[PDB]
């Protein structure tokens, strides 16, 4: 822990500065540091952690997809032997992506999830676990691919179970969870019907609970509902 000597509050403060400067690797490092202090995270702090890592891995995923696209094209015969370079560089980016995923999953396992007793914290962390297994699934090709897929599924399902018992259908975390779990069904599990069904049911259940919300809550909920509708339009 290179952040071991810095105050928890200073790490959080610097994470917020890193966000403003769009320094997401720095942000993730500061938030990792904060988690490793061993105290539970607040709502705002969980959001900082998620934003930092989503941006770091988001960059790596975008790069990996570019490199994989080149690798596949260069392996379509008639292209003339590229050499090992595209594969080697795709593998380098892939390994760095897997490292980040393992880091996040490590933080969740040691010991964010086990200490998370409230619905919002537990659902948030379990959603994250599902997400970082999904990212590993996106690049997995070998012996463990199925077990990686099922780890994502298991985390998402546990999050869903808690969210349905403990949260209203408009809760943005519940909505975000269902959004991402739906994408998992479509893109990873090869289950477009399950994806569509989950997104539609989630959208309709939220619609019917919107009347209970303030103007601010309504904005947050309808933001995620729009993303559900966007995906459904993509898929149907």
């Amino acid at each position: 822990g290179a952040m071991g000597s810095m105050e928890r509050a200073s790490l959080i403060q610097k994470a917020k500065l890193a966000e403003q400067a769009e320094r997401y690797e720095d942000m993730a490092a500061f938030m990792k540091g904060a988690v490793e202090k061993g105290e539970e995270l607040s709502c705002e702090e969980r959001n900082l952690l998620s934003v930092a890592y989503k941006n770091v891995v988001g960059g790596q995923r975008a790069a990996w997809r570019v490199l994989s696209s080149i690798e596949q094209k260069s392996n379509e015969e008639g292209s003339e032997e590229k050499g090992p370079e595209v594969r080697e560089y795709r593998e380098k980016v892939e390994t760095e992506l897997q490292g980040v995923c393992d880091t996040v999953l490590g933080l969740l396992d040691s010991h964010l999830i086990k200490e998370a007793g409230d619905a919002e914290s537990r659902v948030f962390y379990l959603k994250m676990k599902g997400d970082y297994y999904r990212y590993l699934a996106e690049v997995a090709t070998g012996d463990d691919k199925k077990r990686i897929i099922d780890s994502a599924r298991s985390a998402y399902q546990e999050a869903m179970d808690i969210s349905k018992k403990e949260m209203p259908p408009t809760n943005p975390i519940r909505l975000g969870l269902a959004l991402n779990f739906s994408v998992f069904h479509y893109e990873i599990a090869n289950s477009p019907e399950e994806a569509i069904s989950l997104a539609k049911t989630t959208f309709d259940e939220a619609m019917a609970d919107l009347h209970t919300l303030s103007e601010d809550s309504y904005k947050d909920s309808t933001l995620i509902m729009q993303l559900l509708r966007d995906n459904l339009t993509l898929w149907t």
């Binding site: 997400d131 966007d230 995906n231």
Partner: peptide, 5 residues
């Protein structure tokens, strides 16, 4: 990339 959050 479909929408995720």
């Amino acid at each position: 990339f479909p929408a995720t959050v």
